[PDB]
């Protein structure tokens, strides 16, 4: 209504395209560089019909839209934070315990420790790793002996779990193990999904019957042969997949032998590990989400230094994202300051490198800044400009080192810079090419080839080839006195004699003489 009626009725056709008119007759926050092109495009060119395409098309900023979603405060207190931190540690512990439940994680760590000793106290390493192995070798025997039907035998197993929980492993280790377990489960559900896909769909066996049957042993062929011997209409199709199901069951039993665990529970421990993963990850996200403010507030100080506001607060978010990982609620120190340093270090270790087009090392950045900080006083604590010799004297570095440092400063300049302000100048337009050769130079080089190719004609074969092969022309790889002396029987001095005689010949022709210059 308002915009549509005002625009159309006014512009008929405003003669000289009065741009500075209806743009004031438009709502919302003005002075934008977005709404501009959307009016210059309609007015002319495709007139009449373009003015009907406009209204039907009418029937913004990164940072402002970022603060919008950050607007969801959900701020915390000492109570709130510690609560989140408690859930983090809670999630983590269940994961490790779920890992400790895994016997192959202990046995692999054992296997890899023997690898370590086969090539941080070495005796201390031999100490704890001995403790683990000891509890293992005592727990392992209480398995097949079956004494204490996994009640007290279970006690030594969980004691072995605690012993494993004593170990403070490296991040790469825990991730490798956990990844390995999920890969194992991937093979497990691979076989389970294979049996299901083969028996349920290919053999027309209802999902009700498959869940009622397979859920039992899942490994022994006691369920498969009982499914075939059920004399159901979907039982006769199983014969066409007997080898497949058998092959899948045999491989799953193989996994039982690999983990040394009950297949009807590997899902259970893996389940609880996954749960903990979601729990801890969740809390850490809530953590990074909550202290999201702290990032921007401290990143505002580092603004404008060869990197935009969005980039700064982004590294501060990854800077904050790391801080939340290394922190415990069982610490007198609060999160408000501990995170701040990690964020400061995060973006400052980004402004250092990914800022200028040319590379630069951190010590360079610190040295350069120190120079400026020192120079701002020398011209103010005296009265005249800071001389390079004296300024270098006020520093540990000599002087020439400082000179070379200034040759790394600035982006530097971009070619698209106007210079003489012609119609229209650009610095990069004055830049001459030097890698190209003058057509004059190229022409002479060709005539030079002709010159030499024609001069070696007025020579003998045992002299032309000699001159040609020695200085390596028209044959790429040039040879020496020996490699030419061998192919011509007489060695060294003889061939050099001829080589000098050919040079003697070229003392009257003027062609190569003028070609010299």
């Amino acid at each position: 209504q308002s915009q549509l009626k005002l625009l159309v009725t006014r512009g008929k056709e405003q003669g000289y395209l009065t741009y500075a008119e209806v743009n004031d007759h438009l709502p919302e926050d003005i002075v934008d560089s977005d709404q501009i092109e959307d009016i210059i495009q309609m007015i002319n060119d495709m007139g009449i019909q373009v003015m009907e395409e406009a209204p039907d098309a009418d029937d913004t900023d990164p940072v402002r839209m970022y603060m919008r979603e950050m607007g969801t405060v959900e701020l915390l207190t000492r109570e709130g934070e510690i609560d989140i931190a408690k859930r983090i540690e809670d999630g983590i512990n269940q994961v490790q315990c779920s890992v400790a439940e895994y016997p192959e994680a202990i046995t692999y760590l054992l296997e890899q420790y023997d690898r370590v000793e086969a090539e941080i106290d070495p005796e201390l390493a031999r100490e704890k790793f001995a403790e683990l192995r000891a509890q293992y070798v005592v727990t392992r025997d209480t398995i097949k002996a079956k004494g204490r039907s996994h009640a007290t035998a279970q006690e030594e197993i969980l004691k072995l779990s605690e012993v494993f929980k004593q170990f403070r492993l490296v991040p790469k280790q825990f991730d490798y193990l956990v990844n390995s377990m999920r890969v194992m489960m991937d093979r497990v559900r691979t076989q389970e999904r294979l049996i299901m896909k083969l028996c349920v769909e290919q053999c027309k066996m209802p999902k009700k019957n498959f869940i009622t049957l397979f859920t039992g042993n899942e490994t022994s062929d006691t369920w498969f042969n009982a499914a075939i011997a059920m004399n159901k209409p979907w039982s006769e199709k199983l014969h066409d997949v007997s080898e497949e199901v058998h092959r899948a069951l045999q491989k799953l039993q193989q996994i039982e032998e690999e983990t040394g665990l009950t297949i009807e529970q590997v899902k259970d421990i893996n389940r609880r590990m996954s749960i903990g993963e979601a729990k801890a990850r969740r809390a850490k996200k809530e953590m990074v989400e909550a202290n999201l403010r702290l990032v921007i507030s401290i990143a505002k100080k580092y603004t404008n230094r060869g990197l935009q506001f969005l980039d700064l607060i982004q590294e501060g978010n990854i800077g904050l994202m790391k801080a939340v990982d290394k922190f415990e609620y069982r610490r007198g120190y609060k999160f408000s300051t501990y995170a701040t340093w990690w964020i400061r270090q995060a973006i400052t270790r980004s402004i250092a490198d990914q800022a200028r087009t040319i590379r630069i090392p951190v010590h360079m950045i610190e040295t350069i800044n120190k120079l400026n900080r020192i120079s701002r006083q020398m011209l103010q604590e005296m009265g005249r400009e800071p001389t390079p010799e004296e300024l270098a004297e006020r520093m540990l570095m000599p002087e020439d080192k400082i000179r070379k440092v200034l040759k790394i400063a600035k982006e530097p300049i971009s070619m698209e810079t106007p210079i003489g302000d012609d119609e229209d100048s650009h610095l990069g337009d004055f830049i001459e090419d030097t890698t190209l050769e003058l057509p004059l130079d190229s022409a002479t080089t060709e005539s030079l080839r002709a010159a030499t190719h024609d001069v070696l004609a007025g020579l003998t074969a045992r002299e032309a080839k000699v001159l040609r092969m020695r200085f390596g022309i028209d044959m790429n790889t040039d040879y020496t006195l020996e490699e030419v002396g061998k192919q011509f029987d007489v060695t060294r001095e003889r061939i050099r004699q001829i080589e000098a005689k050919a040079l003697r010949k070229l003392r009257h022709p003027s062609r190569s003489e003028v070609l010299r210059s």
Binding site: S33, D34, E37, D38, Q41, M42, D45, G47, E52, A57, D59, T60, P62, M65, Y66, E69, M70, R281, K284, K285, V288, E289, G306, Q308, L310, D311, Q314, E315, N317, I318, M321, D325, Q354, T357, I358, R359, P361, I408, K410, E411, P412, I413, S414, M415, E416, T417, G428, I431, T435, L440, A443, T444, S447, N476, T477, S510, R511, V514, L515, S517
Partner: protein, 1160 residues
């Protein structure tokens, strides 16, 4: 069995979307690091924007590390670093790519006027498509319950709808969401259903959007491109050399902005990839995804939304698009200040020694090593670098018959660049022939011209047979001569006539040449007396040849000797009996039409030599006493100031209307200004007394000043009138006239007051000069942009129709005839004769045969003539239909270039057009070409009927006229404002005036007729050239009117789809091939449509041509959406690609290659 897989000859170029895999095909690696060059070694990083393994090696043949150096390994890559060691120019052509994590929207197909990705999907641009991909309002992707298919949901709406149903309508948000949206879209099935629904019981209340999108949707699907490619997943990288960082002088590198861009996009992209592996907070990752969007959009095309700054420059960064959106320097060139050279011929120019030496450097070298002298090539360089006497003679050899073409700064028309034969001159200035000094519009104020050396063999022949000045005798605009003698020479030949009585006169008779001995040997004068001599005339008739005719005529000394110069033919004596003024050129023209080129050319050199010599002999000067004031000056001024005095006294005592006494006293001074002007002219004109035999007689003043004015040579009435008469009414900055004209004159003193008044005139004179000079070219660009594609082709077609040419007669109430507007015109068909027979069918009205159109008396003043307005040609122009008017005398050579020559001639005299029921001036010319409706358009009767009022002001309304007769009515709308011209009941014809006001060309063409509208445009555009007094042929106006009526609009039912306004090119060629194909009922009847220069030029086949003038960001985009291809006939687009021009010296080339592209 061809199928060659190399870089051979191409017949066309195609433009279309690029698949992510399409980009991968160009990829010679993947940029993965924002790193550019090393901080210390100044060496290309591993996988940065300037890799050596990816793109190309720095040095020519040596690899990065240095394991391989010389030409030994030009095909094998290095062991330590995969560096293909070939050239360094490889670094100038290699592509490369970056592969982003989450998808990114292409800024062009996103926000470029019509949202392509939106209109294709039917969805709002900066409204819905923004809030849906900036992570704000999630969108749907097809649902079989509750939710439609493309509605927009908030987080709250999303989870609510998900809780109700969910897991069966999944619909993401952001970039990849629009991807699944564009991907899921079925162009095929929608193209069917859209055709079904948008045709069912709907009038003109829907057909708009209906026809639009269905044509668009049909286009894209047939284009070949999959809408998947709209938003890219793989963004390709520009070759390093096209955006280098080259060390300037003493450090301080200089880079392009793209490095800033590419470095930002990579950094933002990698952080995105790194975050898609670490903890992924939805707010953090989504923001980084929006930042990648920012980075990519900025690199492709800044525009547009804030402009990414940085780079320390407060100025924005030059993105890719901005580097191709909106001059051609050349080798073998030079320039210098020009100077007149009287001793030259008409095909010769003075080219400086040192200038010509450095210009033909490559030719001197070759000829030197050719002859001997130089042992080798480098010997020659050292030989000419040490300008060694002998070298100059060899220079005299190479420039012998090697034409060099000259050029001046403001090149308005074809005669801006003309070829000459190089003449060595000891000097550092360039000399020019004083005849072609007018074609260039060049003066010797310090003006400087450029020179070019036709290197190519045929490029020399192009220069000799076309651009050579001797072939440009006549003006391309008007048939009259262009190299006609100017100021100095013309006063020369005027002084060679001008019969003066007695004074060493007497009628001592002889025989031509002997008189020359008489003039040098004194005794007799030269401007006497008259005197008689024997004139041996030569004339031809019927069987041509020559017929002598010796006689005894009464010429003068000047006329006798001047007769020697005159060529073999010609009427003789009578051409010299007159004088030297305008006939000075008239003589030259007639000689050309009755003789030919060469006799006319040499005649010009001779008439040039004659004028200068005898003018120098004459010695006309300008002392202060040459500009005599009339004695009645002070008398007339007092009388005028007496009259105006009486009027002011009347205004004092009421009586006369004081409101406009200003106007009437101005007439008094204006009359007063004319009185002095007439008095000064009548006095300075005749005067003199002489003393013939018995004394007492009168001729015309030999007052030098007068002689110059009575013989062209920059001397007009107004200027003279200011010299001795008075500067009349002067303008005031207000625009009003001062009521106290400058009574004094330049001969006299000028008061400080009246000069401070005249200063305004000069300021607004120069300033107005400055505007119309640039505004002239501003018009020419539009003229050419629309016309520079049509060339006279298919020889000479049939057809007889064409505008009935008749003498432009304002003589209805003012008397002003002009009947030369038919000559070199091809006849329509035997245009009658008060009796029988006479004129043939296709016979072009000769220069001598139009003079035969006076032997048929003043009776015959109407002839039908073939014009470019008509001509049933297809994509060109019939040679017959055109004419002949060139510097050449015959009809236009087949495959010329009518358009550019037409535009040039029209926009050339724009320099002498004053901008403002009469607009007048250059602006008036513009409006007629733009075909704009007047501020008060008149109205016409569409169908002939009986006039009656249609409900007196019953709407709305505003009067209503309804001319109904025979069958069916019409209701025109009169807005009360402005009266009428036909009472009720009266009958009208098909297109009668019922507003008696300004006519609209749109209505005229639409109703009156094509011949009518073209006749209107030509006769109305000429009317603004009459007043300015600039002669320009009607053909060229007709030529631009030709493709000014290029397209039309079809109204019925055919293979073409109705509402579409298509050009009569495809229309006629398709309607001719449908009457005899299957049925004429599968085709409709079309209707010519008037569109202005710009609106017409806007439409053109080549997408490359369009990207020249109009908004490249738009044209390249839309031409990309549909798989379009230029192939490849236009002039402009075939120039930027840098190949043979499909006309003139080419044409033959294009025709052969045009037919060649018929096998497949």
């Amino acid at each position: 069995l061809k199928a060659q897989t190399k870089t051979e000859e191409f017949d066309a170029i195609k433009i279309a979307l690029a698949s992510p895999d399409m980009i991968r095909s160009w990829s010679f690696g993947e940029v993965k690091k924002p790193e550019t060059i090393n901080y210390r070694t100044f060496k290309p990083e591993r996988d940065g924007l300037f890799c050596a393994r990816i793109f190309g090696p720095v040095k020519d043949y040596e690899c990065l590390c240095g394991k391989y150096k010389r030409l030994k390994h030009r095909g094998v890559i290095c062991e330590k670093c995969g560096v293909e060691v070939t050239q360094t120019k490889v670094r100038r052509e290699r592509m490369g790519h970056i592969e982003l994590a989450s998808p990114t929207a292409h800024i062009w197909f996103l926000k470029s006027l019509p949202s392509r990705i939106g209109l294709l999907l039917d969805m709002p641009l900066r409204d819905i498509e923004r809030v849906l991909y900036f992570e704000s309002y999630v969108v749907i992707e097809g649902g079989m319950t509750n939710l439609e298919r493309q509605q927009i949901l908030t987080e709250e709406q999303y989870l609510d709808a998900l809780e109700e149903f969910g897991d069966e309508f999944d619909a993401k948000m952001g970039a990849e969401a629009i991807q699944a949206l564009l991907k899921s879209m079925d162009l095929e099935q929608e193209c069917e259903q859209l055709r079904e629904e948008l045709n069912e019981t709907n009038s003109e209340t829907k057909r708009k959007k209906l026809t639009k999108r269905i044509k668009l949707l049909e286009a894209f699907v047939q284009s070949g491109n999959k809408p998947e490619w709209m938003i890219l997943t793989v963004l390709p990288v520009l070759p390093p050399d096209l955006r280098p960082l080259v060390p300037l002088d003493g450090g301080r590198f200089a880079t392009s902005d793209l490095n800033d861009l590419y470095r930002r996009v990579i950094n933002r992209n990698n952080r995105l990839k790194r975050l898609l592996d670490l903890a992924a907070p939805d707010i953090i990752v989504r923001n980084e995804k929006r930042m990648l969007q920012e980075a990519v959009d900025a690199l492709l095309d800044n525009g547009r939304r804030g402009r990414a700054i940085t780079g320390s420059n407060k100025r924005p960064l030059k993105s890719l698009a901005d580097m191709i959106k909106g001059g051609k320097r050349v080798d073998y060139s030079g320039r210098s200040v020009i100077t007149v050279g009287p001793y030259l011929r008409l095909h010769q120019c003075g080219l400086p020694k040192k200038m010509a030496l450095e210009l033909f450097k490559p030719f001197i070298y070759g000829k030197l090593e050719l002859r001997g002298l130089a042992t080798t090539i480098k010997a020659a360089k050292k030989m000419v670098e040490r300008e060694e006497a002998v070298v100059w003679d060899i220079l005299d050899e190479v420039i012998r018959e090697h034409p060099v073409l000259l050029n001046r700064a403001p090149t308005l028309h074809r005669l801006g660049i003309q070829a000459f034969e190089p003449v060595l001159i000891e000097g550092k200035a360039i000399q020019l022939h004083p005849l072609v000094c007018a074609a260039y519009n060049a003066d010797f104020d310090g003006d400087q011209m450029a020179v070019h050396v036709p290197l190519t063999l045929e490029a020399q022949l192009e220069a000799r047979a076309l651009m050579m000045s001797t072939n440009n005798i006549l003006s391309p605009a008007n048939g009259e001569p262009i190299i006609v003698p100017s100021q100095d020479v013309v006063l020369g030949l005027y002084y060679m006539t001008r019969d003066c009585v007695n004074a060493k006169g007497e009628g001592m008779v002889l025989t031509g040449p002997k008189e020359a001995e008489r003039l040098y040997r004194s005794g007799l004068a030269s401007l006497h007396a008259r005197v008689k001599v024997r004139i041996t005339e030569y004339e031809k008739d019927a069987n041509g040849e020559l017929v002598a005719k010796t006689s005894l005529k009464d010429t003068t000394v000047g006329r006798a000797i001047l007769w020697m110069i005159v060529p073999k033919g010609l009427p003789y004596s009578i051409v010299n009996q007159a004088l030297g003024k305008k006939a000075i050129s008239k003589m030259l023209n007639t000689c050309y039409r009755i003789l030919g080129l060469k006799p006319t050319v040499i005649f010009a050199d001779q008439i040039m030599y004659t004028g200068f010599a005898y003018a120098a002999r004459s010695g006309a000067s300008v002392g202060i006493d040459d500009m005599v004031i009339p004695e009645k000056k002070h008398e007339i001024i007092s009388e005028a100031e007496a009259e105006v005095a009486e009027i002011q006294e009347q205004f004092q005592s009421g009586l006369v209307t004081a409101g406009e006494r200003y106007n009437k006293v101005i007439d008094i001074w204006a009359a007063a200004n004319d009185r002095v002007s007439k008095a000064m002219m009548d006095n300075l004109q005749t005067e003199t007394v002489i003393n013939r035999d018995g004394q007492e007689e009168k001729q015309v003043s030999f007052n030098s000043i007068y002689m110059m004015a009575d013989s062209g040579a920059r001397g007009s009435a107004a200027q003279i009138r200011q010299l001795a008469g008075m500067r009349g009414l002067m303008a005031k900055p207000d625009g009003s006239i001062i009521e106290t004209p400058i009574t004094a004159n330049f001969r006299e003193g000028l008061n400080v007051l009246q000069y401070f008044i005249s200063t305004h005139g000069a300021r607004k004179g120069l300033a107005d000069t400055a505007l119309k000079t640039a505004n002239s070219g501003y018009l020419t660009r539009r003229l050419v942009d629309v016309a520079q594609d049509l060339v006279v082709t298919e020889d000479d077609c049939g057809t007889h129709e064409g505008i009935m040419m008749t003498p432009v007669i304002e003589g209805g109430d003012v008397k002003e005839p002009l009947r030369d507007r038919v000559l070199g015109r091809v006849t329509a068909e035997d245009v009658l004769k008060p009796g029988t027979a006479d004129i043939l069918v296709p016979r072009n009205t000769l220069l001598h045969e139009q003079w035969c159109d006076l032997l048929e008396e003043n009776s015959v003043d109407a002839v039908k003539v073939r014009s470019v307005v008509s001509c049933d040609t297809d994509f060109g122009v019939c040679a017959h239909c055109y004419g002949r008017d060139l510097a050449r005398g015959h009809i236009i050579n087949k495959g010329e270039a009518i358009g550019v020559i037409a535009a040039q001639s029209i926009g050339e005299p724009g320099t002498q057009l004053t901008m403002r029921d009469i607009t007048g001036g250059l602006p008036r010319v513009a409006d007629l070409f733009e075909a704009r409706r007047p501020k008060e358009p008149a109205i016409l009767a569409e169908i002939s009927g009986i006039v009656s009022f249609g409900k007196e002001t019953k709407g709305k309304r505003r009067l209503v006229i309804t001319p109904v007769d025979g069958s069916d009515p019409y209701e025109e709308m009169i807005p009360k404002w402005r009266q009428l011209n036909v009472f009720e009941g009266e009958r009208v014809e098909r297109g009668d005036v019922i507003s008696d006001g300004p006519e609209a060309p749109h209505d005229i063409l639409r109703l009156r007729g094509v011949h009518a509208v073209t006749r209107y445009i030509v006769n109305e555009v000429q009317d603004v050239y009459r007043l300015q007094g600039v002669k320009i042929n009607d053909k060229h106006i007709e030529v631009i009117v030709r493709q000014m009526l290029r397209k039309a609009t079809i109204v019925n039912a055919g293979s073409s789809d109705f509402l579409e306004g298509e050009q009569v090119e495809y229309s006629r060629v398709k309607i001719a091939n449908r009457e005899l194909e299957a049925n004429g009922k599968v085709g409709a009847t079309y209707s010519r449509d008037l569109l202005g220069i710009t609106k017409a030029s806007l439409a053109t086949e080549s997408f490359i041509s369009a990207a020249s003038f109009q908004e490249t960001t738009r044209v390249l985009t839309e031409a990309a959406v549909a798989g379009k291809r230029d192939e490849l006939r236009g002039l402009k687009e075939n120039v930027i690609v840098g190949r043979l021009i499909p006309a003139g010296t080419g044409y033959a080339y294009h025709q052969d290659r045009m037919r060649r592209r018929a096998a497949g």
